[PDB]
Design a protein around this nucleic acid. Structure first.
Lengths: 62, 84, 247, 118, 111, 44, 64
RNA sequence: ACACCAACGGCGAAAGCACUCUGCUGGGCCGACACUGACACUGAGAGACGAAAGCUAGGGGAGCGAAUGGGAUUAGAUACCCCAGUAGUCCUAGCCGUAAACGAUGGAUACUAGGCGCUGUGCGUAUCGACCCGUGCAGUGUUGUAGCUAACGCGUUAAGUAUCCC
């Protein structure tokens, strides 16, 4: 299941970001946010590598 | 849990205290450790060995320590005097 | 809402300096009219709530003031503390719980608390620690006194039945608001001060001769002859209420 | 004089280069103190077991106006002055109830100063 | 019986020691502030049971409201096996620090 | 009383060697590995 | 030994105080002969009970 | 600042991290096929973090303590010793971006004796419950075969055999 990985990582970045911006100095979870961004980004380049229209739907969903 | 023997020896210069210890619910073999002629601590060495065991109950550790203490005590008095 | 009919109008004219007309508080004059704000120091309405609706800039102060209403029909101004959420409710009284913004007498409260507006005796309006960040703490209390560390590094046992507005008073950032326009000193009604070396011997005791004159006297003095370093200007027997100067 | 009660604590500040033998009552008003610097000799000699013996002897020889039976000793600190002091009090042999240590055992409070490099 | 509700929120247990003097308004008023917790928490609040007063090791420093007087050797050992949202535990800490008859209140989170 | 010394004997339980340890400076793992390696091997 | 099934809490002052000395200080794993997990868990529990003044931080020295 | 606990121990990518408790939150490990189906590795330039000392701004300042000052040793002593002791040490917000930042060992995968250990989980035995034995893995350590090495040594966590990338 791929779109649950992208969507799940998106909610991960939402909850972790609204953690981090009202907190502002945790330099440990910064790596977690950046590993999630990079991991999701290699997924988006993967599904963009496979398809057009379907990845256009992944952009249009979020 | 078997039960226990300190053996002391007094010769004028030198104490030895020798702690022979015994088994808990876990089958173990102690020696008798003999603590030695130089001024290096006998009670601390003995008691610490017992505490390191936990295999020794408090009553057991204490009774042997009391006997050990008594001999070190007699030894100190004889060394300060000449008893022999 | 300006022109509150609480700005109280008539004053003594600007930043005055005249006793009989002689300059007696030096370097004063200039600026705007600076119409004062009659604010409510001594809260004479206890155990009735009141919201906060406006943080107005008082030109008489270093800090801001705020307009507070009531459940009854009144309007007052009080010093708002740090943390004055707009719309937040303050209430004076004897048993009112501790909140950043309300007032209570100095007995019914714990020790070790940030309070700005305290009274030195009963009946007065408000004396101590009311500047733009002046915060007074409490050391433990006594039978009829209370040792209070006020923001000078100075402790003072005080009468325990004195009103006190608990909170750290806001507008702290005037520690760093620079006057770098270099004529903004004159906008506050503060004329430039001349220096003692560059005056004449009829005016200042350090009226010199040729060149940048060294200070000449055994001690640097005021323009009226008293030594201006270390000489404590305090009457030897006034109160004996302070514990240690701690300065 | 004093309260005239023959029980009282003895404290032995055994320093690394000195000893102090003080003796006081239960409340803490000292009835006598005598140290190694008290009993005559002073310098590198003070703080040796002969100074502990002489300082303890000249300390508790002057409590014979009390004649304290029930003694209890509360020593403190490191040094070569402990064991000679306890042999001195047991030499006077008065009813030494219990000796004890009250040495300050810190829980990493302050930084102790530089190592000596001598 | 306790694993019924912890779908949704958390589980705790607060240890709080008390004054040894009073016997009245001690089971009462501290259960009333437990009802203040009930306004806060509202979950399976059970087993708030009391433990007998015994001599503790060493305690000073009551800090009454302007008292700062009483040393102690004894104290009533309350412990609340309560159950709440993880939000609003710090106000339970302030409630169990500021009140007079509660000193040295350490909460925990049993698993 | 007899001339027996159990305060020295009991003293080596928690030795006064935690006070000759704490006279000189707080220093890190070089001398804590020397003193605590020699001390972890003195009790074994 | 002495695990006794129920977990070690500050409320269990039976197996706790078999682990401290009468001088009141925590004994190591090789003395108490437990696992690492038992040792750390009684460590945190003992220091909790140290907060509640159930246990002394120092016991006054005694003779005779 | 956090004694005993403290262990040749646990975690972090490194630097680092230990009085306890709570809250938010990262990361790891293990199982079942529960799902997708190569989404993988490395990474120029780039970006982040980055002990200590240092600097800007404001607090705070007990101990320790460069500089400094006095005493001593000394031919001399700006040094080791001793007594005072300022910046600093701590905290807030930044800057600085270096260390023997060391495992003196970039990362990743696959394969190649064992012994003795520790930590985490999994299965079976044993009891029916804590043990206890073997093990399946992952990580950490110590001796060590083969092989490599100028030698010392390293040796399944290679400095072995190969492949890739800087």
């Amino acid at each position: 299941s791929v779109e649950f990985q992208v969507f799940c990582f998106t909610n991960k970045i939402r909850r972790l970001t609204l953690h981090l911006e009202l907190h502002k100095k945790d330099y440990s979870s910064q790596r977690g946010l950046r590993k999630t961004l990079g991991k999701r980004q290699r997924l988006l380049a993967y599904l963009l590598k496979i398809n057009g229209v379907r990845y256009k739907e992944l952009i249009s969903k979020l | 849990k078997p039960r226990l023997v300190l053996k002391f020896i007094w010769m004028e210069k030198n104490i030895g205290l020798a702690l022979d210890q015994t088994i808990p619910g876990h089958g173990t073999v102690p020696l008798s450790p003999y603590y030695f002629w130089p001024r290096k601590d006998a009670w601390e060495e003995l008691k610490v060995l017992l505490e390191n065991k936990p295999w020794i109950s408090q009553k057991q550790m204490i009774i042997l320590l009391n006997q050990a203490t008594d001999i070190i005590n007699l030894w100190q008095q004889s060394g300060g005097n000449l008893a022999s | 809402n300006p022109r509150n009919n609480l700005i109280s109008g008539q004053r003594r004219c600007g930043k005055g300096r005249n006793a009989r007309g002689i300059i007696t508080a030096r370097h004063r004059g200039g600026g705007h009219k600076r119409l004062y704000r009659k604010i409510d120091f001594r809260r004479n309405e206890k155990d009735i709530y009141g919201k906060i609706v406006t943080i107005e800039y008082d030109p008489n102060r270093n800090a801001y003031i705020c307009l507070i209403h009531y459940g009854d029909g009144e309007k007052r101004y009080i010093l708002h503390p740090r943390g004055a959420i707009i719309g937040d409710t303050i209430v004076s009284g004897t048993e009112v719980p501790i909140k950043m913004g309300n007032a209570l007498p100095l007995t019914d409260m714990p020790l070790g608390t940030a309070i700005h507006n305290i009274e030195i005796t009963l009946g007065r309006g408000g004396q101590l620690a009311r500047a733009a960040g002046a915060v007074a703490k409490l050391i433990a209390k006594e039978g009829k006194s209370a040792t209070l560390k006020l923001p000078s590094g100075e402790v003072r046992l005080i009468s325990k039945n004195c009103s006190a507005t608990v909170g750290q008073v806001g507008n702290v950032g005037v520690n760093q608001k620079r006057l770098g326009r270099a004529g903004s000193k004159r906008w506050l009604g503060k004329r430039p001060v001349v220096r003692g070396v560059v005056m004449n011997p009829v005016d200042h005791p350090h009226g010199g001769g040729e060149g940048r004159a060294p200070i000449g006297r055994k001690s640097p003095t005021t323009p009226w002859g008293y030594p201006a370093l270390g000489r404590r200007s305090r009457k030897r027997n006034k109160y004996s209420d302070n514990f240690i100067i701690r300065r | 004089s004093a309260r005239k009660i023959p029980k009282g604590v003895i404290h032995v500040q055994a320093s690394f280069n000195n000893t102090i033998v003080t003796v006081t009552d239960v409340r803490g008003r000292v009835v006598s103190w005598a140290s190694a610097g008290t009993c005559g000799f002073r310098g590198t000699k003070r703080g040796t077991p002969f100074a502990a013996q002489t300082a303890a002897g000249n300390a508790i020889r002057t409590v014979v106006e009390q004649g304290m039976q029930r003694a209890e000793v509360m020593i403190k600190g490191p040094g070569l002055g402990r064991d000679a002091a306890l042999r001195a009090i047991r030499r006077s042999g008065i009813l030494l109830s219990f000796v004890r240590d009250v040495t300050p055992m810190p829980h990493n409070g302050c930084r102790p100063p530089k190592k000596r490099r001598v | 019986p306790e694993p019924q509700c912890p779908p949704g929120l958390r589980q705790y247990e607060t240890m709080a020691v008390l004054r040894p003097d009073m016997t009245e308004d001690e089971r009462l008023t501290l259960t009333q502030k437990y009802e203040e917790l009930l306004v806060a928490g509202g979950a399976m609040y059970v087993e708030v049971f009391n433990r007998g007063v015994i001599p503790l090791a060493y305690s000073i420093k009551r800090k009454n409201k302007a008292g700062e007087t009483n040393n102690y050797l004894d104290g009533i050992y309350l412990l609340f096996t309560y159950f709440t949202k993880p939000e609003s535990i710090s106000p339970l800490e302030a409630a169990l620090v500021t009140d007079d008859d509660v000193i040295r209140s350490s909460s925990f989170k049993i698993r | 009383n007899e001339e027996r010394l159990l305060n020295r004997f009991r003293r080596e339980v928690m030795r006064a060697g935690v006070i000759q340890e704490c006279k000189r400076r707080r220093y890190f793992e070089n001398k804590q590995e020397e003193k605590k390696r020699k001390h972890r091997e003195a009790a074994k | 030994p002495i695990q006794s099934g129920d977990r070690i809490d500050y409320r269990n002052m039976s197996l706790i105080s078999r682990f401290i000395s009468e001088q009141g200080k925590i004994l190591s794993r090789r003395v108490n002969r437990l696992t690492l997990k038992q040792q750390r868990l009684i460590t945190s529990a003992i220091k909790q009970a140290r907060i509640l003044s159930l246990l002394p931080f120092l016991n006054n020295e005694k003779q005779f």
